[PDB]
Amino acid sequence: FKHVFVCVQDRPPGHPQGSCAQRGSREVFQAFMEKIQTDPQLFMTTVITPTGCMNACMMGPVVVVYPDGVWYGQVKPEDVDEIVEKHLKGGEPVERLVISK
Amino acid sequence: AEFKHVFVCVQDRPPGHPQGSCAQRGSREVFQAFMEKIQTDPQLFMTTVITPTGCMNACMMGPVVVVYPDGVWYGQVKPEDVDEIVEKHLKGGEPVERLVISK
Ligand code: FES
Ligand code: FES
Ligand SMILES: [Zn+2]
Ligand SMILES: [Zn+2]
Numbered sequence: 117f118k119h120v121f122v123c124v125q126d127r128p129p130g131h132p133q134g135s136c137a138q139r140g141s142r143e144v145f146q147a148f149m150e151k152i153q154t155d156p157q158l159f160m161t162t163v164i165t166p167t168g169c170m171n172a173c174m175m176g177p178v179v180v181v182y183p184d185g186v187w188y189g190q191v192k193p194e195d196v197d198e199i200v201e202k203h204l205k206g207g208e209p210v211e212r213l214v215i216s217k
Numbered sequence: 218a219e220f221k222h223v224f225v226c227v228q229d230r231p232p233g234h235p236q237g238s239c240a241q242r243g244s245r246e247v248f249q250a251f252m253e254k255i256q257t258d259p260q261l262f263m264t265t266v267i268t269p270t271g272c273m274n275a276c277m278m279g280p281v282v283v284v285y286p287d288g289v290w291y292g293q294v295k296p297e298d299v300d301e302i303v304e305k306h307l308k309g310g311e312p313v314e315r316l317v318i319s320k
């Protein structure tokens with residue numbers, strides 16, 4: 117079972133650290149939702165949840181996978197397929213995008 | 218201690234939604250209570266993150282709070298229940314059995 121949390125926080129223009137929504141995170145969340153709902157093996161063992169800020173803004177979009185405790189930063193919508201394949205199904209975090217475990 | 222990450226569903230929905238929402242069931246005050254505690258309390262602030270979320274799909278048992286990496290899901294959480302969760306589980310390591318809906 118894996119629980120993926122995608123920060124979809126938005127903030128007005130002048131916020132110094134920006135926000136994950138401004139960096140494209142609402143498209144990352146939608147991509148995860150589409151993949152999980154259309155994949156038989158993931159649909160019954162994975163939950164995707166949109167969240168407010170998780171305090172790692174400069175590294176957004178931020179995605180955290182529990183219970184593993186893997187934090188990903190700078191996730192682009194194009195990277196969602198790799199995370200789903202290699203980590204959510206494969207059990208191997210996408211090293212290139214990990215910012216913490 | 219270690220590190221705990223608390224997620225509080227703060228999703229709100231228009232009045233007609235069959236399953237209601239956690240915000241309709243008082244979850245934003247539960248989130249606010251966690252925030253007030255996690256920081257007026259040093260031991261907690263340093264080791265805990267409280268994050269508000271959208272629906273976690275267990276609406277009829279809300280307000281829904283999930284603590285990771287433990288994987289403890291709580292339901293029907295009231296603001297008044299926050300101190301017990303903070304003391305027993307977030308500081309003490311022991312989930313509040315009466316509110317657990319899943320581990
Ligand atoms: S806005 Fe997403 S981690 Fe802060
Ligand atoms: S509205 Fe909170 S779990 Fe659905
Ligand atoms: Zn509805
Ligand atoms: Zn409302």
Ligand SMILES: [Zn+2]
Nearest residue numbers: 254299300301
């Ligand atoms: Zn109190």
Ligand SMILES: [Zn+2]
Nearest residue numbers: 313314315317
């Ligand atoms: Zn018992």
